[PDB]
Amino acid sequence: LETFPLDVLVNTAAEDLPRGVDPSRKENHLSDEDFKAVFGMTRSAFANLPLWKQQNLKKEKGLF
C-alpha cells in the first residue's frame, strides 16, 4: 500500500485524503520508521491488540 508522511495522515481533511489511504487504517500507510516512532511496537503486535484499543491509541495520535 502507498505510504505518506505522518503529518499528512494526521493533518488532512477527510475529503482531501490521498485516494490510496484506507481512512480506517491510516497506520498501514505510515513508513516502517514512522510506525515504529508513533506506536513503539511491531505492526503485528499492534494488530493483535483488540480493535477498540488500536482505535483508542490512534485517536490521541490524530490517526483515527
Curated annotation (Swiss-Prot):
Protein name, UniProt field: Villin-1
Family, similarity comment: Belongs to the villin/gelsolin family.
Complexes and interactors: Monomer. Homodimer. Associates with F-actin; the association with F-actin is inhibited by tropomyosin.
Section of the entire sequence shown: 763 to 826 of 826
Location of the HP domain: 1-64
Cellular compartment(s): Cytoplasm, Cytoskeleton; Cell projection, Microvillus; Cell projection, Lamellipodium; Cell projection, Ruffle
Recorded superkingdom: Eukaryota
Region annotation Absolutely required for activity: where it falls in the sequence: 58-61
Functional note: Epithelial cell-specific Ca(2+)-regulated actin-modifying protein that modulates the reorganization of microvillar actin filaments. Plays a role in the actin nucleation, actin filament bundle assembly, actin filament capping and severing. Binds phosphatidylinositol 4,5-bisphosphate (PIP2) and lysophosphatidic acid (LPA); binds LPA with higher affinity than PIP2. Binding to LPA increases its phosphorylation by SRC and inhibits all actin-modifying activities. Binding to PIP2 inhibits actin-capping and -severing activities but enhances actin-bundling activity.
Tissue specificity annotation: Specifically expressed in epithelial cells. Component of brush border microvilli.
Entry PTM: Phosphorylated on tyrosine residues. The unphosphorylated form increases the initial rate of actin-nucleating activity, whereas the tyrosine-phosphorylated form inhibits actin-nucleating activity, enhances actin-bundling activity and enhances actin-severing activity by reducing high Ca(2+) requirements. The tyrosine-phosphorylated form does not regulate actin-capping activity.
Region called Headpiece, residue ranges: 1-64
This protein's domain notes: Consists of a large core fragment in the N-terminal portion and a small headpiece (HP) in the C-terminal portion. The core fragment is necessary for both actin-nucleating and -severing activities, whereas the HP binds F-actin strongly in both the presence and absence of calcium and is necessary in actin-bundling activity. The Gelsolin-like 1 repeat is necessary for the actin-capping activity. The entire core fragment is necessary for the actin-severing activity.
